[PDB]
Design a binder for these strands. Structure first.
Ligand code: TTP
Ligand code: CA
Ligand code: CA
Ligand code: CA
Ligand code: CA
Ligand code: CA
Length: 902
DNA sequence: CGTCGCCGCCGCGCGG
DNA sequence: CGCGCGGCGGCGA
C-alpha cells in the first residue's frame, strides 16, 4: 500500500515522524531534514524556481533547520524577502508525500478516554492535581476494546471490584444498563494502589500509543490532570512518557480575558471532541456537558445518580465505574453519527498538515496552496505583518414588515467561492485597477464598462483572464468535493420523505428493512417495496436515511465552511495571502450581483404580469432573494387548484421553466459587463412557501432584516410530507431563549402561518394560563459568562454590569464559603432567572452553570422567588407582540359588536 | 489567528 | 416606558 504519515513534529534539527509503512505497519523515524528556502535572484541567471509573480528565485539548501531559521532573521535585518515554507514540517510532509495521500483509517490508532477524580474540596484543578485518579477508561480503535483502570484503594475510600455482571443488568434489576454491544469489549483491570495504576497505564500507553487522542474535555481536563498527577508522583520524565518522543510543552491559551494552560504532547494529535463539536456541528447549545449533548444528539437519558459526584465512588462504586465507561462510549456514538474524526482525517491528509491543524483554516489553506504551487516549482511569498483594518461585506435589503402569503426564494450556489472562480481573484492574478463609479451605476447598467481586457469587480480591481490563479484552482477542487456530498445529503433527505409518506399506511407483517444505499434516490422497485412494509421496518429505514443525511451534512457543510474560510482568510492579517483588495473585490461583486438580479427579476415579473414599478422582490440577504408570488397564484386563481401540492407544483414549474432561464440571462449579461473569466453565477430556486389551501394561515412574515418565518412545502427539490417552518433570526432560533419559550413561540408561529388569527389566540390564552407550571430549567434564559471579574466590585455589580453577570454575582454571594457548590466558569454558559422584589438573594436575578440543576443549597429559594410575571412578559409576550404587529394580527381577541347577544 | 451585517436586551443618561 | 448610544451576545449570511 501507499505510505502515509500519522504525526509529524520538529524538535530542534530533527523531524520526528510516525507513519504507516508500505506494509501497513506503524513506524517511527528521526530525520535530520535539510530544508530549502529561497531568495530573488538576477533576471539573467538560469533557474527553475519562480515566485507567484514570475520572478526568478534561487534555492538555498541549509545544513539543518536551525540554520534556515537564522537565515530568515538575517534577511529581516538586511531588509530582503525570505521566500518559501518556513514551517519546516509542512515542507518535510510535502517532500515525503509527493502524491495524493490515500490513508487507511483502520491503521490509525484513535483513542477515546476519560478519567475520574474524587474531590471533597471543590473542582479538581489539573494544574495542581492533588487528588488521586481513581478511574480511567481508555477505548482503543484498533483493538476495539475499552480498557478500564479502576482504583480500589484511595485516601477517599476503599472499594470492591466493579462487577461486569451487574453493569450489564437493567436499571430495573439494580444494574447500570451498560449497552450489551460493548459488554464483551471491556477489559477490566483493578488496582490496589494509584502508583501501580498509573505505572501500568503508562506501559499500556507505550504499547498502544494514540495517534488521534480524543474524548470530552480531554484537552482542558483529562490530559493535563493525568500529566500533572504523574508529574507530582513520579517526576517530569515519567510524565513525558505520554509523548512518544518524550517532549512536552506547558503552554497558555490566549483569546482575550484570562488564561489557561494546556499540555502539548509531541507526536500525538489531540482532537478534543468538544472542540470538534463546536467547530463542525453548526449548533450553539445552552450547555456543553456530555449529558446535554448526548441527549441532544442520540436521545439518550441523562446519567442518573444520587448525591454529589464527590461521594459517588464511596456510596456506589459500581455505578461510578459503569458511568465512566458509558461516558466514553457516548462520545463514540456521537462520532459514529456526526463523523467529525473522519472529516478531520480527510481534510488533514488532503492539505498535508498535522491533523490537529484542521481547527485552523488559515493553516489548512496555507498548506494546500503551498503544495499546489510546489508542484509547479513555484515559491511562496514570505508572511508579512499587517495592521487589522475593517472592510465592507454583504448587502441586506430592508424588508417592509408584513405578512407575505406566497413566497418563492432563489439562492446563488456557493457565492463567494464562485465569485473567486468567475472573477479569477488570486494574489498572482491582480492586473491593476480601474476608475470606480458608484455601485448603483453598475447595478443599473449605466456605468462605463470597466475593462475590455481584464476581469473586473465593481470595487475597482482587475484580474488576468489568460490563466486560473492558484486560489480559484484550489477552491474549485474542494468546492467539487462539497458538491458531491451535498448531492448525497439531499438524496438521503428526499428518501426520508418517501419513508415518512409511507408511514401513514404501514402494512401489518413481520419483515426486514430493505438493504439500500440511502445516498441515491430510491428506484421504482424500492418505492413499491417500501409501500408494503411494516411500521417497524419503515422506522428503522427512516433512522438509517436520517443517519445517511447527517453524514452527508457533515461532509458537505464543513467543505463549504472551508472554502468560505478561504475568502475569510483573505481578510485575516495572519494569512500569507492576506489582501484587502481581494476580500473587498469579492464582497463588493456580491453586493452588485444581488442588487443586479433584484432589478432583473422585478423587470421580468412586471413584464409577465403587465405592470410597472411593482416590487416583486421583498427581501434579500447577501446572495438570496425572496419573491412575492401572490400575483402569480392570482393570475390563475386559487379556485383552479385541487390541493396545496397542486399550487406548489405550479410554482415549482414556473420557477424552473420561466424564472430561472430569465435569471440566467440577467447574470450572463452581468458577466459580460464585468468582462469576467467564466460565468458561474448560478441562482436556483430554494423555497416555496404559502398557507395550506383553504386555510386562514398567513403563510409567512418578516419583522425586519434577518427576522422572518415561512411555511415551506418544498426546499431545493425536497417535497416535504409535512410542511416545515423556516424561521430565521426570531427568538425560536436563539440558544438564549428558554426552551419552553422556544417551543411555545414556534407553535404560535406555526398557528399564524398554517391556521390563522383565531387559532393563535386560542393557544396564547392557554399558554398564559399554564405558564407557571413549567419546570424552572425550561423557562430559564441562557447566556455566556464573559468578563465576570471586570464588573466585580467586592461581590457586587459595578458600573454598566450586564444583567446576566449581575445574576452570576448574586449566585457567587449565595454560595460564598462553600467548597462543594459548582463555581461559574469564565466564558461558559449560565442559566438566568429573574427574582421577585424582596427576595433573600438581595438582587433582581440569579444565574448558575448551565446543564445542571442549581445546587440544593439555594434551589428551594430560587423556585419560590422566581419571577414568572417578568419571565412571561420579557421572553414570551414581547417577542410575540413583535411577530403579530409585523403580521398585522392580534394575539388577543379584540372586542366586537357581537359581544352584545346570547 | 476565516469574514461582515445587524438584530434585541440592557444600563445609562437623558428627555424640559 | 419614551428615546438613542455603546456593550454584549448571538445569529444570518
Ligand atoms: C454561512 C457563511 C456564509 N458566508 C458568506 C459566503 C457565502 O458564499 C455567502 C452566502 O452564504 P450561504 O447562502 O449560506 O452559502 P453559499 O452560497 O456559500 O453556499 P450554498 O451553496 O449552500 O448556498 O455568505 C461566509 O462568509 N461564511 C459563512 O460561514
Ligand atoms: Ca465523570
Ligand atoms: Ca447560497
Ligand atoms: Ca441552492
Ligand atoms: Ca403501505
Ligand atoms: Ca443564502
Amino acid at each position: 500500500m501507499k505510505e502515509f504519515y500519522l504525526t509529524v513534529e520538529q524538535i530542534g534539527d530533527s523531524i520526528f515522524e510516525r507513519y504507516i509503512d508500505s506494509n501497513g505497519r506503524e513506524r517511527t523515524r528521526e530525520v535530520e531534514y535539510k530544508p530549502s528556502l529561497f531568495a530573488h535572484c538576477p533576471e539573467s541567471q538560469a533557474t527553475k524556481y519562480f515566485d507567484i509573480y514570475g520572478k526568478p528565485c534561487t534555492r538555498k539548501l541549509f545544513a539543518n533547520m536551525r540554520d534556515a531559521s537564522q537565515w530568515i532573521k538575517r534577511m529581516e535585518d538586511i531588509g530582503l524577502e525570505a521566500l518559501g515554507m518556513d514551517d519546516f514540517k509542512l515542507a518535510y510532509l510535502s517532500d515525503t508525500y509527493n502524491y495524493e495521500i490515500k490513508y487507511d483509517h483502520t491503521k490509525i490508532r484513535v483513542a477515546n478516554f476519560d478519567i475520574e477524580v474524587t474531590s471533597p474540596d471543590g473542582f479538581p484543578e489539573p494544574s495542581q492535581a492533588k487528588h488521586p485518579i481513581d478511574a480511567i477508561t481508555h477505548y482503543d480503535s484498533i483493538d476495539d476494546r475499552f480498557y478500564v483502570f479502576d482504583l480500589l484503594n484511595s485516601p477517599y475510600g476503599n472499594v470492591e471490584e466493579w462487577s461486569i455482571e451487574i453493569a450489564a443488568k437493567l436499571q430495573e434489576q439494580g444494574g447500570d444498563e451498560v449497552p450489551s454491544e460493548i459488554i464483551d469489549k471491556i477489559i477490566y483491570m483493578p488496582f490496589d494502589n494509584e502508583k501501580e495504576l498509573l505505572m501500568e497505564y503508562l506501559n499500556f500507553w507505550q504499547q498502544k500509543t494514540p495517534v488521534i487522542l480524543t474524548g470530552w474535555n480531554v484537552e482542558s481536563f483529562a490530559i493535563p490532570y493525568v500529566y500533572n498527577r504523574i508529574k507530582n508522583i513520579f517526576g517530569e520524565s515519567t510524565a513525558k512518557r505520554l509523548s512518544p518522543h518524550r517532549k512536552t510543552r506547558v503552554k497558555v491559551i490566549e483569546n482575550m480575558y484570562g488564561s489557561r494552560e494546556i499540555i502539548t504532547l509531541f507526536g500525538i494529535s489531540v482532537l478534543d471532541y468538544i472542540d470538534l463539536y463546536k467547530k463542525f456541528s453548526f449548533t450553539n447549545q445552552p450547555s456543553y456537558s456530555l449529558d446535554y449533548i448526548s441527549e441532544f444528539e442520540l436521545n439518550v437519558g441523562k446519567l442518573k445518580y444520587d448525591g454529589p459526584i464527590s461521594k459517588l465512588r464511596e456510596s456506589n462504586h459500581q455505578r461510578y465505574i459503569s458511568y465512566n465507561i458509558i461516558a466514553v462510549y457516548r462520545v463514540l456514538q456521537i462520532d459514529a453519527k456526526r463523523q467529525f474524526i473522519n472529516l478531520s482525517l480527510d481534510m488533514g491528509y488532503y492539505a498535508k498538515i498535522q491533523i490537529q491543524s484542521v481547527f485552523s483554516p488559515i493553516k489548512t489553506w496555507d498548506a494546500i496552496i503551498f503544495n499546489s504551487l510546489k508542484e509547479q516549482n513555484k515559491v511562496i511569498p514570505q508572511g508579512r505583518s499587517h495592521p487589522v483594518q475593517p472592510y465592507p461585506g454583504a448587502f441586506v435589503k430592508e424588508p417592509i414588515p408584513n405578512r407575505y402569503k406566497y413566497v418563492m426564494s432563489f439562492d446563488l450556489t456557493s457565492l463567494y467561492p464562485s465569485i473567486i472562480r468567475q472573477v479569477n481573484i488570486s494574489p498572482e492574478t491582480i492586473a491593476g485597477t480601474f476608475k470606480v463609479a458608484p455601485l448603483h451605476d453598475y447595478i443599473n447598467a449605466v456605468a462605463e464598462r470597466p475593462s475590455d481586457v481584464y476581469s473586473c469587480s465593481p470595487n475597482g480591481m482587475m484580474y488576468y483572464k489568460d490563466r486560473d490563479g492558484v486560489v480559484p484552482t484550489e477552491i474549485t477542487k474542494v468546492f467539487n468535493q462539497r458538491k458531491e456530498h451535498k448531492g448525497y445529503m439531499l438524496a438521503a433527505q428526499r428518501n426520508g420523505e418517501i419513508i415518512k409518506e409511507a408511514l401513514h399506511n404501514p402494512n401489518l407483517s413481520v419483515d426486514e428493512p430493505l438493504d439500500v444505499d440511502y445516498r441515491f434516490d430510491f428506484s421504482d422497485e424500492i418505492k413499491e417495496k417500501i409501500k408494503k412494509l411494516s411500521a417497524k421496518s419503515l422506522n428503522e429505514m427512516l433512522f438509517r436515511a436520517q443517519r445517511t443525511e447527517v453524514a452527508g451534512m457533515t461532509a458537505q457543510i464543513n467543505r463549504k465552511l472551508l472554502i468560505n474560510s478561504l475568502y475569510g482568510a483573505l481578510g485575516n492579517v495572519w494569512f500569507r495571502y492576506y489582501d484587502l483588495r481581494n476580500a473587498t473585490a469579492i464582497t463588493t461583486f456580491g453586493q452588485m450581483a444581488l442588487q443586479w438580479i433584484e432589478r432583473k427579476v422585478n423587470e421580468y415579473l412586471n413584464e409577465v404580469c403587465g405592470t410597472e414599478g411593482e416590487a416583486f422582490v421583498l427581501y434579500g440577504d447577501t446572495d438570496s432573494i425572496y419573491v412575492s408570488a401572490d400575483k402569480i397564484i392570482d393570475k390563475v386563481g386559487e379556485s383552479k387548484f385541487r390541493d396545496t401540492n397542486h399550487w406548489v407544483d405550479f410554482l415549482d414549474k414556473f420557477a424552473r421553466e420561466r424564472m430561472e432561464p430569465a435569471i440566467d440571462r440577467g447574470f450572463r449579461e452581468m458577466c459580460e459587463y464585468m468582462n469576467n473569466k467564466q460565468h458561474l453565477m448560478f441562482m436556483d430556486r430554494e423555497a416555496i412557501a404559502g398557507p395550506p389551501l383553504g386555510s386562514k394561515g398567513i403563510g409567512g412574515f418578516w419583522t425586519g432584516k434577518k427576522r422572518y418565518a415561512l411555511n415551506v412545502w418544498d426546499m431545493e427539490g425536497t417535497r416535504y410530507a409535512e410542511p416545515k417552518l423556516k424561521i430565521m433570526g426570531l427568538e425560536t432560533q436563539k440558544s438564549s431563549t428558554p426552551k419552553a419559550v422556544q417551543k411555545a413561540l414556534k407553535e404560535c408561529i406555526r398557528r399564524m402561518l398554517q391556521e390563522g388569527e383565531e387559532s393563535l389566540q386560542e393557544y396564547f390564552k392557554e399558554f398564559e394560563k399554564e405558564f407557571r407550571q413549567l419546570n424552572y430549567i425550561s423557562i430559564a434564559s441562557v447566556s455566556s459568562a464573559n468578563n465576570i471579574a471586570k464588573y466585580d466590585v467586592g461581590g457586587f455589580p459595578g458600573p454598566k454590569c450586564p444583567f446576566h453577570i449581575r445574576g452570576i454575582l448574586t449566585y457567587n454571594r449565595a454560595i460564598k464559603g462553600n467548597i462543594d457548590a459548582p463555581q461559574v466558569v469564565e466564558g461558559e454558559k449560565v442559566y438566568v432567572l429573574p427574582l421577585r422584589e424582596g427576595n433573600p438573594f438581595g438582587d433582581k436575578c440569579i444565574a448558575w452553570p448551565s446543564g445542571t440543576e442549581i445546587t440544593d443549597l439555594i434551589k428551594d429559594d430560587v423556585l419560590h422567588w422566581m419571577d414568572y410575571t417578568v419571565l412571561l412578559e420579557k421572553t414570551f409576550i414581547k417577542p410575540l407582540e413583535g411577530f403579530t404587529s409585523a403580521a398585522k394580527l392580534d394575539y388577543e381577541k379584540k372586542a366586537s359588536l357581537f359581544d352584545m347577544f346570547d
